[PDB]
């Protein structure tokens, strides 16, 4: 009613409305889905296309060898956080000559979220990230506008995430102990279910990161082959 | 407040403070500028209380630099502040370039500062509309006009202040290129008097050339105003 004018005012029930609106903005974005198995983590998303004369916008991003993220929400905040994480990883490798601990990086980004939401005159980032990596083990993490992060084994963001989440919970017990090809196939199934009007090599983004497998997006040829495989 | 946004977008997409500054500009005195060949004419209205006010105190038409000159309409204190800023910038340019500041550069700087005072928090927009006349780096005469919003434009003949639209319409149908100095002064006087009471004490016109800015003598102004009054009737 009148407790949503600032991000520092607790409502009578004890809720911050600005952070909730940031979460709403995150939900309003496009789709995405991440899955992991014994080895390899597969991330997939729908690159938004605004018109037939517009190439679809980049969706997935690479932060460092074996580390990649997907975005949902405000693009500017996604860019800011991506720059922050890339600089953190590069500095860690520069002054320690080793890969950065992914959990520490997620802690750092969540702490940035917290700092931004705490002080007045500043707004909470209206973007949600989907961290996927292999630091001696496949890991998937999710962040939120309020300083908070969780670690998943199957995740979806925004858009019509209900269908993808239903599919993921329906087939979760098969993800473990399945080859990379079937992992990619299942991720594509989940994305297509969320699509609700077809998947093409142009409007879909796919990436894999696993053991002895640095983060690399799937090229056009293999992506089209997998799309044909799922189509049949 | 201190370091907090004051000029913000309205629901329709308008900067209300900027429009209020434009309204204030529309409140002030009138001014007119003409150019031709290698010289310009600047005219501005005057308004003083007889027998009490000292005419010399008014500084509506001013010289920024050896060559450039300026006229304005709107708030006077802001006019003085911006004029001091512009003179400091002219001398800084002359230090760092060892060349007199061209009219285009100073017009760009005036637009830049007016825009800056519209986009930073804790300061309200500059409520003045100015017009500068000078010579380009290639010894070519040009006059620019700058508004509170920061939008600038070069003109061949222009008018600002109260009833600026009417004087603009008058100029649009009489301006001619490479006119004589007497003809230019006559046109400038006619334009300023179109929307101003007829008297030799309500105008202070000046002429800009490469040599220097020369203020027209009162006797010549009296003769000119008498002639235009005779023609009008």
């Amino acid at each position: 009613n009148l407790y949503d004018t600032d991000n520092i005012i607790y409502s009578p029930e004890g809720r911050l409305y600005q952070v909730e609106y940031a979460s709403e903005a995150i939900k309003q974005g496009t789709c995405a889905v991440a899955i992991k198995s014994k080895d390899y983590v597969v991330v997939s998303g729908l690159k938004k296309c605004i018109s037939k004369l517009s190439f679809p916008q980049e969706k997935i991003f690479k932060i460092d060898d074996y580390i990649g993220i997907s975005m949902s929400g405000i693009t500017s905040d996604a860019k800011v956080l991506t720059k922050f994480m890339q600089n953190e990883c590069l500095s860690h490798k520069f002054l320690y000559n080793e890969n950065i601990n992914i959990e520490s990086l997620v802690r750092s980004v969540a702490d940035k979220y917290q700092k931004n939401t705490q002080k007045s005159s500043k707004r909470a980032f209206g973007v949600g990230l989907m961290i996927a990596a292999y630091h001696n083990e496949p890991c998937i993490f999710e962040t939120r506008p309020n300083g908070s992060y969780f670690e998943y084994d199957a995740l979806s963001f925004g858009a019509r995430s209900h269908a993808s989440k239903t599919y993921l919970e329906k087939n979760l017990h098969l993800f473990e102990e399945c080859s990379l090809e079937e992992l990619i196939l299942h991720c594509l199934k989940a994305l297509k279910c969320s699509l609700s009007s077809e998947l093409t090599i142009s409007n879909t983004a796919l990436a894999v990161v696993g053991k002895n497998h640095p983060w690399q997006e799937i090229s056009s040829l293999q992506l089209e082959e997998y799309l044909s495989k799922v189509k049949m | 407040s201190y370091d907090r946004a004051i000029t913000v977008f309205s629901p329709d997409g308008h900067l209300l403070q900027v429009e209020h500054a434009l309204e204030a500009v529309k409140k002030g005195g009138c001014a007119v500028a003409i150019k031709s060949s290698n010289f310009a004419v600047l005219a501005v209205e005057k308004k003083n209380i007889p027998k009490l006010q000292n005419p010399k105190t008014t500084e509506k038409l001013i010289k920024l630099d050896e060559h450039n000159c300026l006229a304005f309409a709107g708030l006077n204190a802001d006019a003085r502040v911006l004029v001091n800023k512009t003179r400091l910038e002219c001398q800084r340019y002359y230090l760092n370039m060892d060349e007199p500041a061209p009219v285009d550069y100073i017009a760009k700087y005036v637009a830049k500062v007016q825009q800056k005072f519209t986009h930073r928090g804790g300061v309200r927009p500059f409520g003045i509309a100015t017009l500068i006349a000078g010579f380009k780096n290639n010894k070519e005469i040009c006059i620019y006009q700058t508004e509170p919003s920061g939008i600038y434009a070069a003109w061949k003949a222009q008018a600002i202040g109260k009833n600026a639209k009417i004087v603009q319409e008058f100029l649009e149908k009489n301006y001619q290129e490479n006119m004589e100095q007497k003809d230019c002064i006559f046109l400038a006087l006619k334009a300023i008097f179109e929307v101003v009471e007829l008297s030799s004490k309500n105008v202070e016109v000046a002429l800009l050339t490469e040599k220097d800015l020369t203020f027209i003598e009162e006797q010549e102004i009296n003769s000119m105003v008498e002639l235009i009054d005779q023609e009008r009737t």
Binding site: - | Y2, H20, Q53, N54, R80, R124
Partner: protein, 240 residues
């Protein structure tokens, strides 16, 4: 943010609504006069009466001096008046320090109006509700007289009145003032204007204060009339 006062913000018609209220307050203060003659400049004023126990000796509440050649009179809030007077003295002495010469009056008025404009534009601080009448003398321009206001606007004048009932005083000045006048005639005119604006047929020696600046013998000096001098002056006025 919720308690912000909206001070340095343009009005729907471009007036800021704060310089307006400051000027309105100015119009309620005591009246101040200013004249320029062939022998000096006069800043006769009217003293506001609070009680009968105020020290008559010295105690000048309207006219002050900023330098040996510059002196002004106030028509507004006394606190702002005092701090602006201090700033003016600082500015004059800084100019003398820098250039080893006395500051022309125009420079000082320009500086003080610049600080008033700065207070009117930057920050969220309220403007100064004081209007002066700076008058003095210098070689470059001779006797001069100006008139400021909260907006930082200034203008030259040969004869003026500011404050409450400034309209009637200005009318009298315009009706009677002449291009050249003796210092005595100037004082008589200032006293007449003060009496008329006060709506009193005869001014009271305890209700007014006069002063004048003159360049006698090449050394500019100011004189502030004391009760006996104003008494003799009013006796002369009544005689005429």
């Amino acid at each position: 943010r919720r308690y912000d006062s909206r001070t340095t913000t343009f009005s729907p018609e471009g007036r800021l609504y704060q310089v307006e209220y400051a000027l309105e307050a100015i119009n309620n203060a005591s009246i101040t006069i200013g004249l320029i003659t062939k022998d000096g400049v006069i800043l006769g004023a009217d003293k506001v009466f609070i009680s009968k126990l105020i020290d008559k000796a010295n105690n000048y509440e309207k006219i002050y001096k900023i330098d040996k050649h510059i002196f002004c009179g106030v028509a507004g809030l006394n606190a702002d008046a005092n701090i602006l007077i201090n700033q003016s003295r600082l500015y004059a002495q800084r100019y003398l320090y820098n250039y080893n010469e006395v500051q022309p009056v125009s420079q000082l008025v320009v500086q003080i109006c610049d600080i008033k404009q700065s207070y009117t534009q930057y920050g969220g601080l309220r403007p100064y509700g004081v209007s002066f009448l700076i008058g003095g003398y210098d070689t470059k321009d001779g006797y001069q007289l100006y008139h400021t206001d909260p907006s930082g606007n200034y203008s030259g004048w040969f004869a003026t009145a500011i404050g409450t009932n400034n309209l009637t005083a200005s009318s009298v000045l315009k009706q009677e003032w002449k291009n050249d006048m003796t210092l005595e005639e100037g004082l008589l005119l200032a006293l007449k204007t003060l009496a008329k604006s006060t709506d009193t047929e005869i001014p009271k020696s305890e209700k007014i204060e006069l002063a004048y600046l003159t360049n006698k013998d090449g050394e500019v000096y100011q004189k502030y009339l004391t009760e006996k001098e104003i008494e003799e002056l009013i006796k002369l006025y009544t005689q005429k």
